[PDB]
TrEMBL record, chains A, B, C, D, E:
Subunit structure of this chain's protein: Homopentamer.
Keyword annotations from UniProtKB, A to Z: Cell inner membrane, Cell membrane, Ion channel, Ion transport, Ligand-gated ion channel, Membrane, Receptor, Signal, Transmembrane, Transmembrane helix, Transport
Name this protein carries in UniProt: Gamma-aminobutyric-acid receptor subunit beta-1
Family: Belongs to the ligand-gated ion channel (TC 1.A.9) family.
This protein's record includes keyword Transport: yes
Boundaries of every Neurotransmitter-gated ion-channel ligand-binding domain copy: 1-190
Domain of life, source organism: Bacteria
Residue ranges of the TM segments: 193-214, 226-243, 255-272, 292-307
Membrane topology: Multi-pass membrane protein
Amino acid sequence: PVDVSVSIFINKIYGVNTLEQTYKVDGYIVAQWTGKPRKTPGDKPLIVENTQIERWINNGLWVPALEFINVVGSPDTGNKRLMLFPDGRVIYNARFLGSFSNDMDFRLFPFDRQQFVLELEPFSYNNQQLRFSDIQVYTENIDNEEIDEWWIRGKASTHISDIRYDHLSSVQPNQNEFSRITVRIDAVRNPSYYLWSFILPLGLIIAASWSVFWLESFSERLQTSFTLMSTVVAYALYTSNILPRLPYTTVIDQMIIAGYGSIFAAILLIIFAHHRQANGVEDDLLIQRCRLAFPLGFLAIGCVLVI
Amino acid sequence: PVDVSVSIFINKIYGVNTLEQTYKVDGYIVAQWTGKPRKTPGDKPLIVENTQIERWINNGLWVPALEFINVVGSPDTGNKRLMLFPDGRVIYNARFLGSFSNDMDFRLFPFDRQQFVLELEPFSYNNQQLRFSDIQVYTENIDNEEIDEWWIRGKASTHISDIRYDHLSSVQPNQNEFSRITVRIDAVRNPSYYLWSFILPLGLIIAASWSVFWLESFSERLQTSFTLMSTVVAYALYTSNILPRLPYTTVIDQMIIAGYGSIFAAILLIIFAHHRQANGVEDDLLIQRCRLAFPLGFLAIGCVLVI
Amino acid sequence: PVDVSVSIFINKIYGVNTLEQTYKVDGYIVAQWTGKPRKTPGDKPLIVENTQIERWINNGLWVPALEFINVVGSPDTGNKRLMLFPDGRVIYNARFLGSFSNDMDFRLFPFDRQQFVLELEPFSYNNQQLRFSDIQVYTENIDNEEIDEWWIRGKASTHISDIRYDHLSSVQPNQNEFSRITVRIDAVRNPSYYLWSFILPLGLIIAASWSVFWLESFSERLQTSFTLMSTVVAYALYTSNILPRLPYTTVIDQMIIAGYGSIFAAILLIIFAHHRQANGVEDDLLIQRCRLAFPLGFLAIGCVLVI
Amino acid sequence: PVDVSVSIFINKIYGVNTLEQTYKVDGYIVAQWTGKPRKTPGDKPLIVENTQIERWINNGLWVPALEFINVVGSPDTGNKRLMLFPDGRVIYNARFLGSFSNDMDFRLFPFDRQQFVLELEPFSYNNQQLRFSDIQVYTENIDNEEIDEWWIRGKASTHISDIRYDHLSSVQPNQNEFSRITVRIDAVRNPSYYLWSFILPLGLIIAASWSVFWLESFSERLQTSFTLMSTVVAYALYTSNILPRLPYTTVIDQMIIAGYGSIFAAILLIIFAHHRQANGVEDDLLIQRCRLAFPLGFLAIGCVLVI
Amino acid sequence: PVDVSVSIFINKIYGVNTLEQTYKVDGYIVAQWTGKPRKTPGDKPLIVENTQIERWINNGLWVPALEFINVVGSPDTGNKRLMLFPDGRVIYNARFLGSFSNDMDFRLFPFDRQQFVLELEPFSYNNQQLRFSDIQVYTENIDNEEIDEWWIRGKASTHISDIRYDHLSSVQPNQNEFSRITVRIDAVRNPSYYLWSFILPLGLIIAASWSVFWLESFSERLQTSFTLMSTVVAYALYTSNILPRLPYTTVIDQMIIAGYGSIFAAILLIIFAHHRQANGVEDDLLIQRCRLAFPLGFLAIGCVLVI
C-alpha cells in the first residue's frame, strides 16, 4: 500500500468569481513515492521532462494520476518533470494553474471572511496512501497587502484524511477508501476601496437626504424629496457598475434599500404634516420638526441593521 | 446485444446562460459492460489511466463512444480510466465538465421554475443497450442553498428509453433504435436578491410616483411628473445592468412598463384636470382628488400581470 | 469522378454576433461515397471511432477533407466515426459546433429578416462531386418559439452547385471546378421584448415630451424642456446597455434621434413664441397653441420611412 | 537559393481591437517552390492532407516554416495540404485565421484612416527567397459596404523586400538577410452611425445649451445651466458605453469637452451679468444679450480645433 | 556545469490587467549552449523546426526546459527551431506570447509608475548556468508613443542571479541553487486622456459646484445643491465605465469623494446660514458670503493631498 509524500507550492490566489464560487490558484505540485531500484545513467538521479514522461509510462513506469477534486473542469499544467532515483524513489514535479471551487458566503459583503481550498486525491487508486502533506505559502502576511485585494490570515492549514464512497464498484471486500489531502488558506477582503469610495458617500447621501426637513414651504419639501429619490437610484446604478453580481443582498445592498426607505418615509411624513391640522393650510408645527428626530431614528434602525 | 450500466455523478450545476439556454455540469461518468474474460497481471483488476487507454484500443479493446446528445460543442474530459476485470467486465470512469442545452422559459422571471438535463446515448452503436441508470446528486435536505443561486427541488429523475431516427442509413432490416438515458434535475431560482433589491424599490418608486397628486399648483403637478418620468428611465437603466438579457418581457420588465404607464396616465389626468372647467383657471375639484383613486386603480390592474 | 452524398443535421443555431456577422451552428455532418469492396470482420460493416480513424488513413484509406467555406477559423469537432462497408461504401459521421459567417443586414432592426448559411466544399479535390444534399432541421415551426430568440421561416433550402476559381494552379487542362453545397435557413427576430420594453416606452417619452406646451408660463415651458432633453439622453443610455452594437443606425436608433429633434424643435418654438410679438412680454397667442399641432406634425412630417 | 511563390487570399478582416491595435484576418496561404522530381502514384500530382503532412516531413520532405512576423501569439490553421508534383514542385495550401498587429492612429476618430497589414517571412531560412507575392481581396469595390463597418480603399498593396537583422548568429560571412513579403490594405471607417446617432445629438445638446440666455430672471439662468451641466455628463456616460476605449482624446471626446466649456462659460457670464452694475440688482443690459454672440463665438473657436 | 547564453527579444508589451497585475509580452527567446560536436549534413549547421525537435529529443538530444517563473499559467509558443552546429553548439529559437505577473501599484493613478518583468530560470537543472543575458527592446524612444498607451523609460535592465530554494529535494550536498535571469523594463502611463477628458471636467464640476453661494434665496441655495449632489453621482458613474476596476482608491477616486464632500459641506453651511440669526428669517450676512472663502478652502484641502 504505497506511500506518497505531497508538497504543494501556492504562488498566487487571484480572481475570485463571486457568482460561481471560484478562484484561481497558480503553483507547483510535488509527489514522491519510492519504487523498485533502477539503473540510472551515471549514478545520478535521472531527469525526465514533459514530452518524455509519457514515454516512460509507455515502457511501464507507473505514475499515478492524482485529481484535484474541487477543481473546475481541468487545469493548465505547465512544466512536468519526473526525477527518477537509483534507489528507486520518484519525484513528480509539475507547475499548474487552475480554477477551484469552494462554498463562499459573500453576505457580510465588504468586510468579508473567506477561505481558499484545494483537494487532492488519487484518481483511480484505493490503497496507495498520501503520507504527509506540505504547503509553501509564498506571499506574506502583512507585507504590502494594500496593493493586494485580499489579506491572508493565515498560514496554510493541512489535513490528510480518508474518504469513503458509498456507491462503489464490483470490488467491495473493504475497497472504498481513498486518501485525500485538503489544503485551506484563510483570507479577509481589503475593506478599503469599499469603505471610502462606497459606504461613505452612500452615507453622505443618506445624510443630506434628511436636510429635506429644513425647507420652509410644503411644496419645497415634497418636490425636493423627488430629486432625492432619484439621487438614490442614480447611486444604485453606480453600485451596479462596480460591485460583484450576487444572488443575495449584501451589506451595501441594504444600506441602499434603507436609502429608498428613509426618503419614502420622508414623503409620507411631509404629506402627513400638511393635512393633519385643525385650521386650513396649517402644517403640523411639531411633526415638521422631526428635523433631528429620525436621523437618530435611523441610527436606531441602523443599530438593529447590526443584529 | 451488449448491456451497459451507467452511473453519472453530478458535482455542480452552475452558470446558466439565459440567452443561449445553456448551463454547466461538472461530474463523473461511469460505464460498465462485461466482455470476454482476460488475463490480468496479478489476478486483481487492471487499471489503465488517460494516455494508456488509447493504447488498449489500438490493440483491439472495444470501448464505445457515448455522446452527450444535448451538450454544446464538446466537453472537457478530465481524468479517464479503464478498470479491466479478469472475469471480463470493464468499468469506464471519466470526470467531465461541459455545457448543456435545454428549453428554458424565463418568462415568470425572478420566481423561476427550471430543469437541468443530460442526455447520454451511444454514438455509433444500435444494439448495445443502456441497462440501468444511476445519478448521484451531491447535496441533501436542509442545506445552505441561500449561499447558492438555485435551489434543487428535487432528487434526480431518470429515464432509459429507446429513440428512433427516421433518416437512417444503408442498414434498415430493423436498425434505427438507439438507447438513450435522460437525466432531469428540477430547480427553482433564489428569489431573494431580486425581491429585496429589485421588486421592492421599483414598488416604492411606483408608489411615491403617485404622491404627485398631493401637490397644490397645476404647474407643480406637471413639472414634477417629468423628473418622475426620468426616475423610471434611470431605474430601467439599473435594471439593464443587473438583469440577464432576454428576448421576452419578464415579470420585472412589466412592472417597469407599468411605471411608465402610471406616470403617463398622471400626465394625462393632470392636464385634463386643468382644462376641464368653465371659462377659467378652475382645476376640476374632484378629478385632482384621485389622490387615492388610482393607487387602487393600479393594485386593480394588478391581479393581471401574474394572474 | 467520385460521388459523395451529404447529410447535415442542424441542431441549434444560437448566439448571433451582430457586429461580426457570425452565428453558431451545432450539428452533425454525414458523408457517404462508395469505395473498393473490403473484408470486414464478421461480414457486418466496420465501425471506426475517433482515435482510430487516423490509423486507417495512415494505412491508406482515403477520407477526403471537406471544408466549411464560410466557417470562422476552424470548428469544434465532437465525435467522428467511419462506418466501412463490405461492399465498399464508406459513411463518415461527425458531430460539430462552429461559428459561421454570412452577410447580415440589421438595419430594419427589431423587425429583422435574416438567413443562416453553411457552405461545404471539398478542400483539395476537383473531381470528386457532391451527389445530393439533405438537411434535417430538428427545430420546429409555430412550436414554442416565444421561448426562442428567433423564428425560423423556413424549412431548409439546399443548392449543390459548381464553383470556379480563377486563380488556379499549375494544373489547367480544365481543372478549376469544385463541388459546393450551400445550405440556407431563413429566420425572423422575435420582435417581442423590443416592442414592449423598448419601442413603447420610447414613444411614451416622446409623447409626454409634447405636454411641454400645456404649461402656462414661458419660464416653465423652457426649463421643463431641459429635463425633457436629458430624459432622452438617459434613455439612449439604457438603449446602449441592451441593444447590440452596430455600425449603422437602426429603427430604434432613429426614433431616439427623433426624440432629440422634437425637443430641440420645442426649444425653438417656445423661445420663438416669447419674442415674436406686437408688444412687450406677449407670448404669441396662437403659436404657443401648437399643443396638438406638432404631435400630428410628428406622426406626419417624420413618418415617411414607409416612403 | 530557393524560389518560393506566395499567394495569400484575404477572406475577411474583422474585429478591430482599438486599444491593442489588433485586427483579425481569415484567409488562405499558398506557397510553391520546386524540388527534386518525384515518383507520384499514377503520374498525377499527389495530395497530402492535414495529419499526413507531418509524416512526409518525418520521412525527410523539407517544408519551410514561414512566420507571420506581426501576428499576435500564433494563429488558427484550418486545413493544410501539400500538393506534390512529379516534376518536383510543391504547393502548400493552408487556411488560416489569426490576429495581427499594426500601428493604428484613432485620433481623428469617427472619420478614420486605417491600414491592415500582414508580414510573412521565412522563420529559419536565410537563402530561400520569396519570389513574387499575390493577394486576392475577395470583398469588393462597388458593393454593400454600408452593411459593413469598414470600406476598403483599396486594392491590395504588395512589397517583397529584404530585411537585415543586426544581432545575428555565429554565422556571419554575409548571412543576416531574410525575404519578407509585406501586404497592405487601406481602409476607412463607416462614419454613419457616429454622425447620426452621435455627433448630431451632441450638437443639438450643445446648441440648446445656449438657449440659457433667453431666460428672463438671473435665478432661472443659473439654476438652468446646472441641469445643463449634468445633461453633458449624462451624455458623456452614453459615450462611454458605445465608443471604443482609447488612450487619447478623439474628435468626439473633444466636442464633449467643449460642451463642458460652453456651459462653464455660461455660468461665468451669467454670474458676471448680475454683479457688474450700477444701481443694485441691475443685470448688465448688453452682456446678458450675448444670446447670439457666443453661439458664433463657438462656431469660431471650434473651427480652429480641426483646421 | 553548462553555460547557456540567453537572448530575449521584446516585441510588444500590451494589455495590462489592472486587477490581476498581469501584462502581455510577445517576443522571441534565444538559448545557446555548446555540446558534443556533431556530423551535420553538408558541413553547414542543421536546422530543425517545430514538429521535428521532439524527434531529436526522442533520439537523445538534450534540450533543457526553461520556465518563465512569473508567467501566468503557460504561454503561447509560436515557431520553435533548433539550430545544431557541427562543432557542437546548439541555438534554440522560439517565438512566444504570454501573460506575466508582477507587483503593481496603481494608487497614484493616471500619473503612473510601472515596471514590466520577465523571470527565466531552468526548470529542472541545478548546475547548468545562465551565462550572459541580452534584451532587444524594439519599441522606441520619444517616437510616436502618443499613439501608445505607455511610454517606456527605459532601456531594458538585466540581472543574472542565483536563487536558493529552502525546501529542496532528497539531494542536498549543496544542490539548491538555480540560475535566474530577471529582465526589467520601466514604464509610465500616458496621462493624456485622463487629464483632459477626466481630471479637468471633474474640476469644472467641482468648481461650478461652488457657484451655489451666488444664489439669492435660501430655498434656491438648498434645492440647487441637490441636483449638484447627483451631478457628482452621475459623474462617478461615468468614471465607473472608463476607469479600470481596482481594490484601492486612486487619485481620481479621491477627487470624486472631495466632490461629495464640498457639496455636503455646502448643504451644511447653507442650512447653517439660515438658522444662525437673531430671531427671524435673517440669513447670516457674512457666512453666506463664503462665496470665495471655501473655493480656496478647497485648494487648501486638496493640497495636503500630496504633502
